[PDB]
Design an enzyme around this catalytic site. Structure first.
Site, PDB file in Angstrom:
ATOM      1  N   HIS A 153       4.046   0.732  -4.172  1.00 27.24           N
ATOM      2  CA  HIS A 153       5.399   1.141  -3.706  1.00 27.24           C
ATOM      3  C   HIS A 153       6.384   0.658  -4.891  1.00 27.24           C
ATOM      4  CE1 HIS A 153       3.617   0.795   0.202  1.00 27.24           C
ATOM      5  NE2 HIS A 153       4.189   1.618   0.554  1.00 27.24           N
ATOM      6  N   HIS A 192       6.101   6.218  -7.394  1.00 29.27           N
ATOM      7  CA  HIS A 192       6.002   6.584  -6.204  1.00 29.27           C
ATOM      8  C   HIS A 192       7.188   6.917  -5.520  1.00 29.27           C
ATOM      9  CE1 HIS A 192       5.189   6.877  -1.526  1.00 29.27           C
ATOM     10  NE2 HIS A 192       6.432   5.684  -1.392  1.00 29.27           N
ATOM     11  N   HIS A 219      13.863   5.954  -1.055  1.00 25.14           N
ATOM     12  CA  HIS A 219      13.260   5.617   0.154  1.00 25.14           C
ATOM     13  C   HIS A 219      12.216   4.278   0.164  1.00 25.14           C
ATOM     14  CE1 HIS A 219       8.486   6.475  -0.585  1.00 25.14           C
ATOM     15  NE2 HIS A 219       8.587   5.971   0.532  1.00 25.14           N
ATOM     16  N   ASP A 220      11.499   3.798  -0.753  1.00 27.56           N
ATOM     17  CA  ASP A 220      10.823   2.561  -0.631  1.00 27.56           C
ATOM     18  C   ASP A 220      11.437   1.427  -1.486  1.00 27.56           C
ATOM     19  OD1 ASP A 220       9.095   2.922   1.167  1.00 27.56           O
ATOM     20  OD2 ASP A 220       7.619   3.753  -0.176  1.00 27.56           O
ATOM     21  N   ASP A 235       6.251  11.506   1.479  1.00 28.16           N
ATOM     22  CA  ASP A 235       5.868  10.127   1.113  1.00 28.16           C
ATOM     23  C   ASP A 235       4.281  10.073   0.944  1.00 28.16           C
ATOM     24  OD1 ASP A 235       6.144   7.430   0.626  1.00 28.16           O
ATOM     25  OD2 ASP A 235       6.977   6.744   2.677  1.00 28.16           O
ATOM     26  N   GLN A 268     -10.505   7.151   3.870  1.00 21.56           N
ATOM     27  CA  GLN A 268      -9.717   8.324   3.623  1.00 21.56           C
ATOM     28  C   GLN A 268      -9.891   9.360   4.371  1.00 21.56           C
ATOM     29  OE1 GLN A 268      -7.291   8.664   0.529  1.00 21.56           O
ATOM     30  NE2 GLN A 268      -7.220   6.558   1.396  1.00 21.56           N
TER      31      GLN A 268
HETATM   32  C1  LIG Z   1      -2.081   8.634  -0.506  1.00 21.25           C
HETATM   33  C2  LIG Z   1      -2.316   7.581   0.709  1.00 21.25           C
HETATM   34  C3  LIG Z   1      -3.759   7.258   0.889  1.00 21.25           C
HETATM   35  C4  LIG Z   1      -3.361   6.359   1.955  1.00 21.25           C
HETATM   36  N1  LIG Z   1      -4.618   5.662   2.540  1.00 21.25           N
HETATM   37  C5  LIG Z   1      -3.888   4.892   3.493  1.00 21.25           C
HETATM   38  C6  LIG Z   1      -5.026   4.067   4.188  1.00 21.25           C
HETATM   39  C7  LIG Z   1      -6.260   4.939   4.799  1.00 21.25           C
HETATM   40  C8  LIG Z   1      -7.188   3.916   5.118  1.00 21.25           C
HETATM   41  N2  LIG Z   1      -8.154   3.353   4.160  1.00 21.25           N
HETATM   42  C9  LIG Z   1      -8.963   2.631   4.872  1.00 21.25           C
HETATM   43  N3  LIG Z   1     -10.016   2.062   4.519  1.00 21.25           N
HETATM   44  C10 LIG Z   1     -10.450   1.274   5.417  1.00 21.25           C
HETATM   45  C11 LIG Z   1      -9.929   1.153   6.912  1.00 21.25           C
HETATM   46  C12 LIG Z   1      -9.058   1.831   7.069  1.00 21.25           C
HETATM   47  N4  LIG Z   1      -8.292   2.740   6.200  1.00 21.25           N
HETATM   48  N5  LIG Z   1      -7.322   3.551   6.472  1.00 21.25           N
HETATM   49  C13 LIG Z   1      -2.771   4.507   3.757  1.00 21.25           C
HETATM   50  C14 LIG Z   1      -1.795   5.525   3.046  1.00 21.25           C
HETATM   51  O1  LIG Z   1      -0.561   5.393   3.314  1.00 21.25           O
HETATM   52  N6  LIG Z   1      -2.253   6.258   2.223  1.00 21.25           N
HETATM   53  N7  LIG Z   1      -1.570   7.165   1.464  1.00 21.25           N
HETATM   54 MG   LIG Z   2       9.274   3.041   2.970  1.00 23.47          MG
HETATM   55 ZN   LIG Z   3       6.992   5.394   0.535  1.00 21.47          ZN
END
Ligand SMILES: Cc1cc2nc(CCc3nc4ncccn4n3)cc(O)n2n1
Ligand SMILES: [Mg+2]
Ligand SMILES: [Zn+2]
Length: 322
Positions: free
Chosen positions: A78, A82, A116-117, A227, A279
């Site tokens: 962040h 970004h 934004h952040d 985002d 992912q």
């Molecule tokens: C570009 C981008 C990728 C991304 N990935 C996540 C988290 C996804 C996630 N990975 C995990 N590993 C283990 C358990 C649960 N999760 N959930 C949040 C985000 O904002 N972004 N943004």
């Molecule tokens: Mg934000």
């Molecule tokens: Zn953001």
């Protein structure tokens, strides 16, 4: 609150974008990563194309951009990168939908993406409300978003930073409205209902871009699309931005563990080998529907969806061992 030095911003006016980048930057999948020195310059470039070399006082715009930079913490995800990366996605979205948005929205939205952040700590909303910060004691929901916007208002009201000063008092208050919703809309929590609504509205064909709150919704969805666009880049770029996201997550988790608390799998560096599955989960439940809905409302935005699909199958391979 924090401001910039004369040196920095004067270095911004001299800057001219290397001619090879002019075609590449128009691409949605364009990656700003190899060009750090140029990040504030690129923003300028994009505003200059987006609405002329005179929608803002040149001098007054450079001040702003550089203060905003000053207010991004040295956090792994962040951060300033970004901010701009997001801003570039929005730029491409506006460029491909030339006659859909007002001049006011265009400026409004590029400025909101940059802020934004703003002044992000590296901590989630949950984390601050959970235990038990002053920033959560001021803003109850969309905790970090409100701060983000408040930081924004403050930078604007600094000495000759107010890039929006020339406008009417009703255009001023209104672009701020536009800016506010936009930023607030970057709260992933709010995305799910919003998208769900647009999906319905479009399905019955009641979606109306003449309707002000439909616009606000569509814009929200655009902000979310922006985002999250690490997922829309070329695979090798997507991989590394992935490493930046988790570094920040895991440090948050590490704070939960320093007090005995199990952080949820996402934030848990002991849960490394589950990252690819995470992912894929996220592309499916979040990314894909975002771009799918958006592509539908704004066909020209399709390349984002395409690229998201591309990466999603790369994670598959990763999971399936290849
Ligand atoms: C570009 C981008 C990728 C991304 N990935 C996540 C988290 C996804 C996630 N990975 C995990 N590993 C283990 C358990 C649960 N999760 N959930 C949040 C985000 O904002 N972004 N943004
Ligand atoms: Mg934000
Ligand atoms: Zn953001």
């Amino acid at each position: 609150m924090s401001i910039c030095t004369s040196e920095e911003w004067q270095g911004l006016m001299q800057f001219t974008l290397p001619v090879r980048l002019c075609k590449e930057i128009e691409l949605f999948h364009f990656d700003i990563g190899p060009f750090e020195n140029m990040w504030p310059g690129i923003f300028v470039y994009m505003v200059h194309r987006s609405c002329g070399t005179s929608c803002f006082e040149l001098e007054k715009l450079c001040r702003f951009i550089m203060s905003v930079k000053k207010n991004y913490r040295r956090v792994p995800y962040h951060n300033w990168k970004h901010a701009v990366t997001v801003a570039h996605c929005m730029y491409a979205i506006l460029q491909n939908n030339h006659t859909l948005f007002t001049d006011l929205e265009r400026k409004g939205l590029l400025i909101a993406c940059l802020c934004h952040d703003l002044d992000h700590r590296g901590f989630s909303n949950s984390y601050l409300q959970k235990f038990d910060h002053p920033l959560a004691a001021l803003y109850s929901t969309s905790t970090m978003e409100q701060h983000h916007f408040s930081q924004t208002v403050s930078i604007l009201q600094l000495e000759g930073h107010n890039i929006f000063s020339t406008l009417s008092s009703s255009e001023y208050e209104q672009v701020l409205e536009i800016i506010r919703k936009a930023i607030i809309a970057t709260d992933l929590a709010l995305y799910f209902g919003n998208r769900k609504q647009l999906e319905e509205m479009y399905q019955t064909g009641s979606l109306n871009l003449n309707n002000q709150s439909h616009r606000d919704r569509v814009i929200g969805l655009m902000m979310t699309a922006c985002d999250l666009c690490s997922v829309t880049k070329l695979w090798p770029v997507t991989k590394l931005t992935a490493n930046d996201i988790y570094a920040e997550f895991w440090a948050e988790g590490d704070e939960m563990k320093k007090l005995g608390i199990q952080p949820i799998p996402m934030m848990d560096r002991d849960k490394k080998d589950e990252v690819p599955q995470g992912q894929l989960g996220f592309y499916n439940a979040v990314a894909i529907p975002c771009y799918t809905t958006l592509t539908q409302i704004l066909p020209p935005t399709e390349p984002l969806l395409k690229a998201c699909r591309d990466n999603l199958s790369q994670w598959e391979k990763v999971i399936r061992g290849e």
